[PDB]
Design a protein around this ligand. Structure first.
Ligand SMILES: Cc1cc2nc3c(=O)[nH]c(=O)nc-3n(CCNC(=O)OC[C@H]3O[C@@H](n4cnc5c(=O)[nH]c(N)nc54)C[C@@H]3O)c2cc1C
Ligand SMILES: Cc1cc2nc3c(=O)[nH]c(=O)nc-3n(CCNC(=O)OC[C@H]3O[C@@H](n4cnc5c(=O)[nH]c(N)nc54)C[C@@H]3O)c2cc1C
Ligand SMILES: Cc1cc2nc3c(=O)[nH]c(=O)nc-3n(CCNC(=O)OC[C@H]3O[C@@H](n4cnc5c(=O)[nH]c(N)nc54)C[C@@H]3O)c2cc1C
Ligand SMILES: Cc1cc2nc3c(=O)[nH]c(=O)nc-3n(CCNC(=O)OC[C@H]3O[C@@H](n4cnc5c(=O)[nH]c(N)nc54)C[C@@H]3O)c2cc1C
Ligand SMILES: Cc1cc2nc3c(=O)[nH]c(=O)nc-3n(CCNC(=O)OC[C@H]3O[C@@H](n4cnc5c(=O)[nH]c(N)nc54)C[C@@H]3O)c2cc1C
Ligand SMILES: Cc1cc2nc3c(=O)[nH]c(=O)nc-3n(CCNC(=O)OC[C@H]3O[C@@H](n4cnc5c(=O)[nH]c(N)nc54)C[C@@H]3O)c2cc1C
Ligand SMILES: Cc1cc2nc3c(=O)[nH]c(=O)nc-3n(CCNC(=O)OC[C@H]3O[C@@H](n4cnc5c(=O)[nH]c(N)nc54)C[C@@H]3O)c2cc1C
Ligand SMILES: Cc1cc2nc3c(=O)[nH]c(=O)nc-3n(CCNC(=O)OC[C@H]3O[C@@H](n4cnc5c(=O)[nH]c(N)nc54)C[C@@H]3O)c2cc1C
Ligand SMILES: Cc1cc2nc3c(=O)[nH]c(=O)nc-3n(CCNC(=O)OC[C@H]3O[C@@H](n4cnc5c(=O)[nH]c(N)nc54)C[C@@H]3O)c2cc1C
Ligand SMILES: Cc1cc2nc3c(=O)[nH]c(=O)nc-3n(CCNC(=O)OC[C@H]3O[C@@H](n4cnc5c(=O)[nH]c(N)nc54)C[C@@H]3O)c2cc1C
Ligand SMILES: Cc1cc2nc3c(=O)[nH]c(=O)nc-3n(CCNC(=O)OC[C@H]3O[C@@H](n4cnc5c(=O)[nH]c(N)nc54)C[C@@H]3O)c2cc1C
Ligand SMILES: Cc1cc2nc3c(=O)[nH]c(=O)nc-3n(CCNC(=O)OC[C@H]3O[C@@H](n4cnc5c(=O)[nH]c(N)nc54)C[C@@H]3O)c2cc1C
Ligand SMILES: [Cl-]
Ligand SMILES: [Cl-]
Ligand SMILES: [Cl-]
Ligand SMILES: [Cl-]
Ligand SMILES: [Mg+2]
Ligand SMILES: [Mg+2]
Ligand SMILES: [Mg+2]
Ligand SMILES: [Mg+2]
Ligand SMILES: [Mg+2]
Ligand SMILES: [Mg+2]
Ligand SMILES: [Mg+2]
Ligand SMILES: [Mg+2]
Ligand SMILES: [Mg+2]
Ligand SMILES: [Mg+2]
Ligand SMILES: [Mg+2]
Ligand SMILES: [Mg+2]
Ligand SMILES: [Mg+2]
Ligand SMILES: [Mg+2]
Ligand SMILES: [Mg+2]
Ligand SMILES: [Mg+2]
Ligand SMILES: [Mg+2]
Ligand SMILES: [Mg+2]
Ligand SMILES: [Mg+2]
Ligand SMILES: [Mg+2]
Ligand SMILES: [Mg+2]
Ligand SMILES: [Mg+2]
Ligand SMILES: [Mg+2]
Ligand SMILES: [Mg+2]
Ligand code: NA
Ligand code: NA
Ligand code: NA
Ligand code: NA
Lengths: 62, 62, 62, 62, 62, 62, 62, 62, 62, 62, 62, 62
């Protein structure tokens, strides 16, 4: 059985790096992280632009 | 990084109050709740009508 | 077996009241109405504003 | 011909009031506003909760 | 309040059995599991075919 | 001209059998039933699991 | 309150004529038909091509 | 950079002519109109039927 | 077994004629073409307008 | 690089068997078939019922 | 109240840079640009490849 | 007439590079490749992360 958590990563560099940011966090807390599916992307436009990528991160249970 | 949980709130009053019910629960257990996105709405039609609003509730990790 | 009818309720007060308007009509004509799922919402903007909520209203057959 | 603008209204009271907030703004600047279609709803969760409703607001050209 | 977890069950037999696999896991760890909504289905095609069914599994909080 | 009715069939066995349950009901009351399109699937999780499959069932008018 | 029926019209001429075919049928049986929304279009490719347009046809109840 | 405006054209003749009606209006007011994407179609059913086609009309900025 | 190819037909006349253009091409190269489903429509706006209709064209294998 | 073909399998038994029918055909003609994603399901309702499952079948190129 | 404009940015480098191109244009003409949501991505494949990213760019009114 | 093939490109660097990988393959085998539309993005999370971008790649027939 796989479980997915819905995480939004952030980066001041790119959408790819923002996806990586979410995956990094998943891997810090979860075992057996296997894949991620991009579900949304955006940009927070402030003093700087922060790229965001929302991902379902799938991990194998047990 | 943000994480979202998928909660369905309920109210005998309104769709807004049902969204609030879910957010109330999120805030009881989670720190740094920042926003909610409505993803579904409905009504359980019994002795009384119960309005339901399903929300992704986003919170900041750490 | 459940059957759904696609009804648009109207209210000069709120989206919740507009959903109720549709459900009210369903319950006037149908037996065993059990739930409603919101599928669209809008506002007719005239002399007054009329809130509309479109619902699939599910009822149990037999 | 109709044209639509994509507006997000806000209210500390309800999703209906947030839709109204967007429509109010449309009517301040545009002639012949005829209808609005809800396209998203959410809640900014801060010191207070701010309900938001995003609407396509349609107006007749000329 | 209901909460949903997003689980992908697997079976070498059928899409129904794969949905059951996810629900089985939910019921092992969670109290008050009430329903599941199918959100995706697929097949891993290897030495054998493994049917997968992704479900939102809803449970009542408290 | 074809008309569709939106029916949710149920089965304690499978998603296919649940689709059949809806079609069975359609054929009991309607003439010239020609096809069904699956639009949703789920499982009611109680004393037993009840698989549900929602179908648009198309029939030829006249 | 409005109600919608889901009809597929057919024409050997055009998608517009196929929409009209569905509306024609609605108006033959129903009072207060007010609008139709196109939800699908296709073509049956046989001895001749038959254009099909599926519409939700809305009518005012009472 | 391209910008899109969301216009609903109308015609008593056809969905194609309704798309053209929107594009005609775009070209009256905007420079460098390049393409249109159909996003919705419907029919206002009154004394006469009025076909409507909603289009995103894209134009090149500058 | 059916297979679908994703084709975009073009016409300077209408969306229906553009669908036909795609189907014409399918029938030139493929045996047992049975149906087409419209998946997108648009207009290339140049010296002339070119209507486009994208279709999944289904054909029976073998 | 992966490529997907869009196939509709058929079975007089089940949606799972219909998915298998499509995959069987893919594997007869293609090398390195790796997965399938269900994209639609339905039932042809004639002398017998024929379950259909449409799948994107992914295979590795080279 | 927020308003969104639908812009397609372009870059010969990346999807992120294409999103930035749209945002750059928004900020040249509009005050109080706050966020952007990615709604489509593609690539024009000519003498060179031009990455495109379509964004809803939100700005605060007044 | 345009035809689209559904390809998933891969890269250990970025989503843009993964889109390019698919387009590269298309251009190796097909004439008159004109555009690509991104339809999905994800990441295979193993010894290394492999970014994937699924694209419809459109080419002109003849
Ligand atoms: C993908 C995406 C979707 C969103 N959706 C919403 C929304 O639906 N409603 C909303 O209020 N804010 C959103 N936001 C806004 C979160 N805020 C944000 O991005 O702010 C960027 C900068 O602008 C400043 N800022 C925040 N709120 C406001 C504001 O209301 N007005 C102005 N002028 N500036 C503002 C603070 C930051 O330096 C979204 C941000 C992203 C990246
Ligand atoms: C948004 C939404 C989606 C749903 N979707 C489903 C579904 O897909 N399948 C399903 O079985 N029940 C659903 N439900 C039903 C959950 N039950 C429910 O709302 O019941 C309302 C009242 O009706 C009674 N009830 C429950 N099940 C039945 C039933 O089967 N028949 C009758 N006559 N009444 C029933 C108990 C409550 O007093 C949904 C409820 C809501 C609010
Ligand atoms: C959710 C939603 C979707 C819609 N979609 C369409 C549409 O696609 N095409 C369309 O013609 N009208 C629509 N309508 C319009 C139905 N008419 C409507 O709301 O009118 C409100 C007031 O404006 C007046 N009105 C109606 N049509 C016209 C018009 O064409 N121009 C002007 N200036 N006003 C008009 C009569 C009412 O007092 C929609 C209304 C709602 C609430
Ligand atoms: C519908 C909707 C979609 C959104 N989507 C995004 C998004 O995609 N990315 C994003 O960064 N912020 C969003 N936002 C956030 C806009 N900010 C926001 O709602 O903040 C509410 C309160 O929380 C505070 N806040 C803002 N950003 C943060 C934050 O990052 N962490 C914490 N702890 N608090 C924060 C300021 C306000 O008092 C969305 C808000 C709404 C209402
Ligand atoms: C619903 C669904 C969506 C997917 N989506 C992706 C995807 O987007 N990207 C991806 O790389 N793999 C996917 N997969 C692939 C997961 N792998 C998988 O199913 O492998 C089946 C058998 O094929 C073998 N395999 C795995 N990767 C490859 C591969 O790259 N090439 C070949 N020839 N075989 C492979 C191992 C297994 O025995 C998906 C599997 C399923 C069931
Ligand atoms: C596809 C699908 C969508 C749904 N969506 C909703 C919904 O949106 N809101 C809702 O209240 N119930 C739903 N339901 C719930 C209908 N009820 C249901 O499935 O109950 C299964 C068993 O659990 C018991 N049950 C019902 N409601 C409750 C509950 O609230 N808590 C607990 N612990 N158990 C409950 C009675 C049955 O023996 C859905 C059921 C299905 C199959
Ligand atoms: C929009 C749309 C969606 C569809 N979806 C399906 C589907 O999902 N499954 C399916 O079996 N048939 C479909 N059909 C097929 C309905 N049949 C049909 O269009 O047939 C056209 C001509 O081809 C002949 N035909 C029917 N079935 C067959 C077949 O299986 N093979 C061949 N070679 N020809 C056939 C009879 C007619 O003269 C669809 C038709 C349309 C117009
Ligand atoms: C695509 C589309 C979506 C829509 N969606 C809505 C909606 O969501 N809510 C709504 O109130 N009206 C709509 N409309 C209605 C706009 N009105 C409309 O089409 O009216 C046609 C004729 O019927 C008459 N009409 C208008 N409103 C009524 C009405 O309420 N009842 C009756 N019997 N007739 C009416 C005036 C015109 O001669 C839509 C029209 C179109 C073409
Ligand atoms: C449904 C649809 C979706 C599209 N999507 C895109 C897109 O996402 N990105 C893009 O660059 N072009 C598109 N196109 C543009 C393809 N080009 C096109 O339609 O051009 C029409 C006339 O305008 C001229 N043209 C082409 N590119 C340009 C341009 O960039 N600027 C100007 N002023 N004119 C142009 C040549 C033709 O005579 C789309 C065309 C259609 C019909
Ligand atoms: C998922 C799905 C989507 C479809 N969509 C369409 C459609 O959009 N338009 C259409 O014409 N037929 C469809 N079809 C119809 C393909 N035909 C079909 O299923 O026929 C079943 C039995 O009924 C008989 N049949 C075929 N067409 C007719 C018909 O028009 N009327 C009657 N009474 N029976 C008919 C022959 C078979 O024994 C679809 C079939 C399936 C399984
Ligand atoms: C996301 C996206 C969606 C689109 N959708 C459409 C469409 O729906 N219909 C369409 O005609 N063109 C599109 N386009 C095409 C816009 N044209 C384009 O990208 O052209 C790229 C290069 O190919 C050349 N080119 C343009 N049109 C044609 C063509 O018809 N054939 C050939 N062989 N080459 C062509 C000129 C450029 O150097 C789309 C481009 C993008 C980036
Ligand atoms: C976008 C996308 C969608 C997918 N969807 C599915 C799916 O629906 N079902 C599925 O089984 N695998 C998928 N996959 C999985 C394909 N496998 C994959 O990415 O594996 C990455 C690394 O993890 C290892 N791995 C593969 N399967 C398993 C596994 O089951 N458990 C563990 N712990 N590790 C695994 C091999 C690779 O080094 C998807 C991969 C991508 C990139
Ligand atoms: Cl989720
Ligand atoms: Cl828009
Ligand atoms: Cl319906
Ligand atoms: Cl496809
Ligand atoms: Mg930096
Ligand atoms: Mg988002
Ligand atoms: Mg009360
Ligand atoms: Mg729901
Ligand atoms: Mg009042
Ligand atoms: Mg509507
Ligand atoms: Mg207050
Ligand atoms: Mg939003
Ligand atoms: Mg076995
Ligand atoms: Mg999936
Ligand atoms: Mg049993
Ligand atoms: Mg459902
Ligand atoms: Mg003729
Ligand atoms: Mg259809
Ligand atoms: Mg005329
Ligand atoms: Mg519309
Ligand atoms: Mg001509
Ligand atoms: Mg397109
Ligand atoms: Mg049998
Ligand atoms: Mg289908
Ligand atoms: Mg360069
Ligand atoms: Mg696009
Ligand atoms: Mg590297
Ligand atoms: Mg995918
Ligand atoms: Na989730
Ligand atoms: Na219906
Ligand atoms: Na817009
Ligand atoms: Na395809």
């Amino acid at each position: 059985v796989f479980k997915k958590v819905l995480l939004t990563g952030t980066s001041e560099e790119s959408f790819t790096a923002a996806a990586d940011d979410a995956i990094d966090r998943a891997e810090d807390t979860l075992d057996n992280v296997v894949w991620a599916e991009v579900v949304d992307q955006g940009v927070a436009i402030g003093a700087v632009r922060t790229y965001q990528t929302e991902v379902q991160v799938a991990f194998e249970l047990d």
